[model samples]
Target: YSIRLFKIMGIPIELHITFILFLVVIIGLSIMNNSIFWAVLFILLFVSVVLHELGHSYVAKKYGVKIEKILLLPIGGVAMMDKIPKEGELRIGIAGPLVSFIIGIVLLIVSQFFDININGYPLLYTLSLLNLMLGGFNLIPAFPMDGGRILRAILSKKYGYLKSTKIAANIGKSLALIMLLFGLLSMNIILILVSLFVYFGAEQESRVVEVETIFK
Candidate 1:
C-alpha cells in the first residue's frame, strides 16, 4: 500500500513513505546551503519525473493496458500496468523518453524566448539536463530499460517473445556487471545503486517472462 499523494490527468499518483527520504535529502542540502533553492529544484525535477512516467501510462492506456497506478520513489516513478500488449510494446517503450526529450526542448525554447539562458543558472540548467538524462539514460540497451524493451519488441517480431527477452536480459545483465565493477573500483554510490537495480531488474523481468511462457 502507498500514500495517495494526488491525481493528475485522472491517474492516481501514489508515493511510498520512503520517498520522504529523498525530500529530506534535498531539504537538508538546502539548509546547509542556507537557501531554499535546492528544495525548489528538487520539486521541479520530480515534476519532470512524473511527466516521464505519465508518458508511459497514457500510451499504455491507449493500448488497452490496465494501469494500476503510478508509484513514486526516490529514483523515479514507476507506472504499474497489468500486462504488456505486443501490439503496442515499441510505442509504449519509447513514449516516456519521447516525453522527456520534448520537455527538455520546450524548456530550452521557452527560456530563449524569455531572454534567459538556463545554462547561466546552475540549478535551472541541471533541471533541463535532468530531463534530457531522464530520456537518454532510460534508453540504455539493458533489459527492463526502455531501450531494452524496444529491442525485445522489435526482435520478438522476428524471434518470438521468449527468445527475444532472454537475449535482452542477458545483454542487460552483462552491462550491469560492468557497471558493478566500475562502481566498486571508483567507490561511487550512485553507480553501485544503478548497477544493483539494473542487475536485479533484468533478472526479475526474465524470470517473469519465463514463467508466463511456461504457463502458456
Candidate 2:
C-alpha cells in the first residue's frame, strides 16, 4: 500500500513504508496536546507545504521545466526537477516563497475578518498565527528562500549569478546575525534555533554559488 502512490506533472513521486512512520514520529514529537490535534496539524502542514511547492512548480512549468514529482517529508516539501535552467534559477527559486507570502497575507487578512473568539477555540488562533508567521518569515530575503531568490534573480540580471549570490548571502548573514543577537538576549530558544539555521543556510548556499561558479 505504501508503494501505491505514483507521479504527477512528468515528475515521479513516491514514499517508502518508512516515510509515513517518520512523519508520525515527528508529528508526535511536535505537539504538546492531543495526538489527533497533532495529526491534523501535520496534515495541514503537508497541505501547506504542497501548496508552497506547487507555487514553485507552477512557475517552473511556465518556463517549461519538467517537474518530476513532489516529495513531502516532515521537515518540508520538495518539488523535484529534472533540469534547472541556468537562466531561470531566480524565477523558480523565488516563486515558492512568493506563493507562501501571498498565502500568508491572505490568511492573516481573513483571520482579521473573522470574529475569531480565542476563548472559543485557540486552535483557530494558533493556525492563523502560524500561517502569518510562516509567510512573514519566508519573506526575510535570504538565500535558498523565495525572497532571497527574488533578490538574487534581480541582481543576477545585472551582476551575474555568483555576484548576486554574494550580495544575497551577505544580506542574509546580516539578518541572521541580528536575529542571533536579539534571540540570545531574549533567550528565545526557538528564535535562537531559527537564527542559527538561517545563518548556516546562508553560508551553505553562498558556498554552493561559489562552487557553481567554479564548475559552471
Candidate 3:
C-alpha cells in the first residue's frame, strides 16, 4: 500500500510501504547510533528524489500527459504518467536528470561559499555528491532509468516506437546481466538487487510496448 504524502502541482506524491519500512530502518539505526545527522541526510535524499520526479511530471503535464501520481520507493521515484507521447518522451525523460544536475551544481556552488559540516561530515558537499551520483546513475542508458527512456525516444524517431523499445529493452537487459555477473563476483548485494530491478523493468516495459503496439 501507499500513503499520499502531499500534492505537488495537482499531482499526488505517494510513499510506498517499502519506502516507509526503509525509512524506519534508517531512522532506527540513526537513533541507535545517536546521530540525527544521518536521518536528516536520508530525508533530504528523499526530498531530492521527489524534486527530480517533479521535474519529469512538470514536463509531462505540459505535453498533455495525465500524471497519476509520483511514487516513492526504497530504490527511487517514479512519475506515473498516463500514455506519455513519444514526441514528448525525450524531454520528459531528460527533465529529471537535468533537475538533479542543477541541484547538484547549485549545492556545490553554495558549498564553495560556506563550509558546512555535521559531526565531521561536510553536509553540503555530501548532498551535492549524492545528487550528482543520482543524476549520473540515472543516465546509465539502461531500462527504467531516464537515459533508457531518452535512448528509446531517440531510437523511436528512426526505428519506430515498438522496435525502439525492443532494442532499448534488450540493451537494458544486457547491462543488467553484466551487473548481475559483476555483483555475484564481488558479492555485492546492492548491485545484485539493482540488477534484478533493471532486468525485470526492461522485460516489463518491453512487454508493455508490445501489448500497446498490438492494441494500436
Candidate 4:
C-alpha cells in the first residue's frame, strides 16, 4: 500500500503507491530522451516538496498538534494532522513555504561561492527556481493555501473561525475558477489540475472546519 521511507525527527515519511507512477513517468521520459540528468532533477524536486511538508509537520508538532503522517505523492507532499492551535496556525501554515524559500536562498548563495557553472548540471538552478515558485505559489490567497490560512488566522482574531473560513474558501473558489478558465484557454493540463486541487481542497477544508466547529 505504501513504503515507509524513513523517520525524520520522529516523523514517519511514506510514499504512496500512486507516486510510483510518477517515478515511472519521469524515468520513462528521461530514458526515452537519454536525459538522465532531468530524471535526477525531478527526484530532487520531489525531495524539496518533502522538506516543505516536513517544515509544516515540525512546527505543528512543536505546537502540540497531532501529526498523523507525511504522505508523498506525484503532485506534492501532504502533512496530515489534527486540529492546529488557533494561536499557532499562522506560524505553522507559513513554515512550509518559509522552508522552501530558505532552500532557494541557500542554493543560490552556495552556487555563487562554489563557482558552480549554472550550465553544468543545471538541476541545482532549476531546483532553486522551483522552490521559489513553490513558496510563492502556495502564498496565493486561496483557501487551504498557506496565504489563505495565514489570512484566516489574522481574521479569526476579529471575526469567528467559521466566517473567516467561509471568506477564504470563497476566495479560493474564485481563484480556482480563474485558473481553470486560463488553463482551458491555454491548454495547460498542469494548470487545470492545480485549479481542480484548489477548488476541491477549498471545499473539503471548509466542510471539515464546519464539522469541527459544530462538534466543539
Query: In terms of TM-score, which candidate is strongest?
Result: 3
Candidate 4 residue pairs in backbone clash: none
Question: Tens digit of lDDT per residue, candidate 3, span 1-216?
Answer: 467687766777878665676677677778788887768777767877777887877788788678866766533565555577756787888888888889989998998889677777777777787778778888877676788888887777799876788888899899999999999999986687667667766665565522222121
| Candidate 3: 10-residue stretch with minimal lDDT | 207-216
Per-residue lDDT tens digits for candidate 2, residues 73-93, read: 322333444556765667777
Worst 10 residues of 4 by lDDT: 207-216
Model 2 lDDT, residue 96, Cα: 67
Taken over the whole model, the C-alpha lDDT of each candidate is 0.71, 0.61, 0.75, 0.72
Root-mean-square deviation of Cα positions for candidate 1 versus the true structure, in angstroms: 5.8
Candidate 1 is scored at a TM of 0.71
RMSD of each: 5.8, 7.2, 5.2, 5.4
Point out where model 1 deviates above 4 Å: 1-38, 72-78, 113-124, 203-216
> In candidate 3, how many Å is residue 166 off?
4.2
Cα-based TM-score, every candidate: 0.71, 0.60, 0.76, 0.73
Ranking by lDDT: 3, 4, 1, 2
Clashing pairs in 1: none
Ranking by TM-score: 3, 4, 1, 2
lDDT of 4 at 66: 90
What does candidate 1's lDDT look like per residue over 110-204, in tens digits?
65545333324554445667788878888887665678878887778788867787999899899989999999999996687667656665765
